[PDB]
Amino acid sequence: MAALTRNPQFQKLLEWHRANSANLKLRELFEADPERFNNFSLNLNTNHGHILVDYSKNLVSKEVMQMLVELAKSRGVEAARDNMFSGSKINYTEDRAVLHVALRNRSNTPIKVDGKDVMPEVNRVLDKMKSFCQRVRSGDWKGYTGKSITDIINIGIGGSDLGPLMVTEALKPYSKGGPRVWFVSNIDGTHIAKTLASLSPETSLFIIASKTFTTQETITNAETAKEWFLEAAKDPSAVAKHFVALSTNTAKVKEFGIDPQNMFEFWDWVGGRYSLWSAIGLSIALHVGFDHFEQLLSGAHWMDQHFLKTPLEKNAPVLLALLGIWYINCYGCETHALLPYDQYMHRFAAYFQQGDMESNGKYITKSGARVDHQTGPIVWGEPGTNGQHAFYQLIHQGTKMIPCDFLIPVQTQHPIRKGLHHKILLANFLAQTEALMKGKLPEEARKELQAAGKSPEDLEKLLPHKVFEGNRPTNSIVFTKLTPFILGALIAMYEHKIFVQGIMWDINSFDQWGVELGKQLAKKIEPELEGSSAVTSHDSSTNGLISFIKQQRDTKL
Amino acid sequence: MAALTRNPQFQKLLEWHRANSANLKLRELFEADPERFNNFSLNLNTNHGHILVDYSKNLVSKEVMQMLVELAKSRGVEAARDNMFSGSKINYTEDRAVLHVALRNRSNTPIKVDGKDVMPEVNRVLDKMKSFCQRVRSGDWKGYTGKSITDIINIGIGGSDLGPLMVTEALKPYSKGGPRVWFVSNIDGTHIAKTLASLSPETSLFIIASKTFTTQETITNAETAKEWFLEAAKDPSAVAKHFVALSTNTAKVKEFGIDPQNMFEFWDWVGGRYSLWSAIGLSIALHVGFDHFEQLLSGAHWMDQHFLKTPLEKNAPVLLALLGIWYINCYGCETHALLPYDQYMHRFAAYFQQGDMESNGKYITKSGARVDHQTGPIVWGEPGTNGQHAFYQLIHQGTKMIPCDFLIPVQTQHPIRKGLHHKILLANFLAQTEALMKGKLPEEARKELQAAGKSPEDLEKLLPHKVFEGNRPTNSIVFTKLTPFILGALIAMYEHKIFVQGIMWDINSFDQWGVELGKQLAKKIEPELEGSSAVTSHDSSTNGLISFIKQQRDTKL
Ligand SMILES: O=P(O)(O)OC[C@H]1O[C@](O)(CO)[C@@H](O)[C@@H]1O
Numbered sequence A, B: 001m002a003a004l005t006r007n008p009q010f011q012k013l014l015e016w017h018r019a020n021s022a023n024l025k026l027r028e029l030f031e032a033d034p035e036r037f038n039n040f041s042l043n044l045n046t047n048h049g050h051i052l053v054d055y056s057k058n059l060v061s062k063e064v065m066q067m068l069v070e071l072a073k074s075r076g077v078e079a080a081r082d083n084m085f086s087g088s089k090i091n092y093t094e095d096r097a098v099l100h101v102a103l104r105n106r107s108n109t110p111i112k113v114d115g116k117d118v119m120p121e122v123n124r125v126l127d128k129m130k131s132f133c134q135r136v137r138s139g140d141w142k143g144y145t146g147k148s149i150t151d152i153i154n155i156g157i158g159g160s161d162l163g164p165l166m167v168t169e170a171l172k173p174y175s176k177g178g179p180r181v182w183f184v185s186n187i188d189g190t191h192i193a194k195t196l197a198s199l200s201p202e203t204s205l206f207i208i209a210s211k212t213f214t215t216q217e218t219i220t221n222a223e224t225a226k227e228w229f230l231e232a233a234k235d236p237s238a239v240a241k242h243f244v245a246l247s248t249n250t251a252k253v254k255e256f257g258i259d260p261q262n263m264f265e266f267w268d269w270v271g272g273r274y275s276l277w278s279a280i281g282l283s284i285a286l287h288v289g290f291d292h293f294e295q296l297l298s299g300a301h302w303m304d305q306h307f308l309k310t311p312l313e314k315n316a317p318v319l320l321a322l323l324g325i326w327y328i329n330c331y332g333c334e335t336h337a338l339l340p341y342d343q344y345m346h347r348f349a350a351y352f353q354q355g356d357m358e359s360n361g362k363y364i365t366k367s368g369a370r371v372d373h374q375t376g377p378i379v380w381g382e383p384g385t386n387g388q389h390a391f392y393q394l395i396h397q398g399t400k401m402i403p404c405d406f407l408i409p410v411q412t413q414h415p416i417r418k419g420l421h422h423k424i425l426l427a428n429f430l431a432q433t434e435a436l437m438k439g440k441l442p443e444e445a446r447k448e449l450q451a452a453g454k455s456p457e458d459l460e461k462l463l464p465h466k467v468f469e470g471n472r473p474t475n476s477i478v479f480t481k482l483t484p485f486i487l488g489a490l491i492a493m494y495e496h497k498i499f500v501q502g503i504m505w506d507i508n509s510f511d512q513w514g515v516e517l518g519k520q521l522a523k524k525i526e527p528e529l530e531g532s533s534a535v536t537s538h539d540s541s542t543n544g545l546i547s548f549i550k551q552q553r554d555t556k557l
């Protein structure tokens, strides 16, 4: 077996679920206990806004929460957390520290890796970012024709793309005085082509973002950008005015031809999917200003301290993690929906697809044993209220159990029509979780059908279609306003949720060996596509698809 | 029980799965049979490009496919299809026909509802769309100050938003000479506010898209747009130059204040999530031109005829549906990933979230029986190659089985760098499904680690982490080019897949009762948010969340 399934607290939880989970009905839990909301929610005061984590609409009792907390303790969560924060090499397959918390360590308390405090270098790079942001935003940094920069283009993929994109989207109201920001990520030539079509080489600055600086998509895109730039500038020395790099790989950055002073460094203990807090966040700092970037870091730091100091039973990321374990390992739910009622947060779910799924989509434990249980869920979602008119039909009346996190700011960035739109948004946010919990009883639906003037025959037939079974669990995460600080806290909260789940599953949340095979096979196929010769080196499907490509690529439509 | 589970062909399939499915090994299936690709793929010649549906990397044999086709026959798929196409009222809970196929019926063969051919009215509205598009796109249509229209703004949600958005994104290269198109959908005031900030009332044309013309988000957004417009124009007669409606509800359109000559009608037998082919497609036709819109319809028509006339064993939407049933009802897979290797197709997955999940996220059958089996899956995905760097880790090395559809055009719209980007894109498309199929055996990983110079201790530690179990099934859908015609064919193909699955499950793919409760409860909460008084009328969570909103909404941040 595996560490989790051999754990007696887990076995107790699973046995309790088998015997008792059918007795858990949300409607009944609330009716029996008027203090339920009070006892199953956390109202966090950050001193820069409140974050309410309301987990009361979950299929849990006091006893279940107790069993879950006991499991976190007996799986070593507290010790593992302390090991992360102290610079222990908890990324055990790669023998690396895991120190995204150092990037936003506003206290500047020493954090050592190999006996050396990492904070001076973290702060050196942050200082460099601040100076660069001043130069660019002020207009002092000139392009090759002497004009101020108006557009920033981040080129990167995965962890070097999703964070900066999601955060600049979420913090758009804070971007006054900043350059426009663009994100090129896909190797698909459409991406860079459509981006470059709208830009001038005179006023565009490219940020080449890559931890390794060897990712094929990013380097190829970067080289395409450089070719486009040099077509207009016709001067290799002008590249230094229009290209900067964010990387750990000094040598590869030099090889590409980027100025050493134009390199913003980070470290191997910064995972790509945990990197927006580092040099990788340069496009964020350029767009919304360095002050707002520091606020983002500070919010994350607040949540780091919350995670570090708080007893597990009232520790927000721990509780979210534990509810997830309950649904994944006891109920068997494959997915987790993230439903932000905020258009600015439209890339939040996509971000946590990498954050969660690349971290915990794993099957080998620390001992080398294969898991004999589920690990990370499939994360998905779209902003409310849009989702209500897309897929909530299935959440309400399908055959799947889907834990959902509903998120919303109390205060909107755009209080148009004296707050009318936000009133409606909030009402929908509240009503949907209420609806998911309560459902609609046959007696309720029957009266509605009767009042609608339905015949006895029509009523009979329609009735079951109009019933909502309910008992569908949700979290509601409500916060004062989506400021840089609060966004930072929210992202950090989910980072630590993911960490806790990984520890409980005994997996490594911080490596990504599962991307290797696809990369290897793509390197083999690339040269085979050129020319007219038949490819026979693969299975018949791969060969057949290549044959189709070669036959169809010259056809004129 | 329910129709599917009571069906003897289904029980035979399920029994076969229990006894034999563990013996299906993709790597071995391909090695043993060089004809596998040929026997498990469909190369469709539309005369306007080819669509290759390669389903050979699925966990199926000849026997499995035979059983699935027999099940489709036993479930009356052909008769149900014919009934849809003939105008029978197969939406039985609403007593409506289901006739998105009539919208693109290029043959003009009569299709009757209530004894009356619907084609004359379909074509009348199409002619109106054509005339309007010519007037706007030519610059002839002038705004209230006498300027040509530069911006089109679609206001709508769900079925009145997702189709037009997805298609205008996918067909962006075909939009030269067309006005800019914007989509406003969320009630969240951010959506309309940030859109209006970039527009002039003099040169903006609003399209109010709503089947019912009573949806709160859409009517509120429309009223906000009208107020903004009238603040500038100060003349109610000017509204007729700047607002058009796409609806079935003439009375409510008139009540809003839109001219009857500015209404583009559709019909009750056009489902919202099947509506882009109707008047709802006006923003598509305006953006890319009516000719390209007609090509889109024509592509769908081709696929309709394929679905109608082809034996089930060679019928693309039927086979895709059956493979889906195999994974959903025999393997128990909750999800289905759509992974287009095309940046222009970045909203394709979101579109089929509504199309699939709102259609088949159901639990009551035609007999009135509650299903005792799974219905529609959770649909999700992001375009390749981005997904590879976000969540493919989980697909390769997680604990979930996830059927994936990989899609790509052979010809790119942007063959930059002499085709280099598209070469790399294609290589990744091919490699990923190869990798998912093949995996990497412990002995294969061992040899790789030994070659890398790893010590016996280092090798043994890393080995299990480097193993890929493989046997992960995919479809590869490859097409000559993503033209309007081919896109139309692809969308229709999935529409019919969804139809076939719904018939087999004995559910109604065409209603959506599951959205009612959320709407009702939101109407109740709306007025309660007004004022400072505490709300005690709900469960303690809803009450508590409302208390938090009221306490937090005045804080300065
Ligand atoms: O076009 P309407 O009538 O405004 O409806 C919008 C959407 O809301 C729904 O009725 C409910 O999700 C969808 O079916 C529809 O597409």
Ligand SMILES: O=P(O)(O)OC[C@H]1O[C@](O)(CO)[C@@H](O)[C@@H]1O
Pocket: A157, A158, A159, A160, A209, A210, A211, A212, A213, A214, A215, A218, A272, A273, A358, A512, A515, B388, B389, B390
């Ligand atoms: O920043 P890099 O080195 O270009 O890597 C990009 C992405 O590719 C991965 O290494 C593999 O998906 C991610 O972890 C990472 O975020």
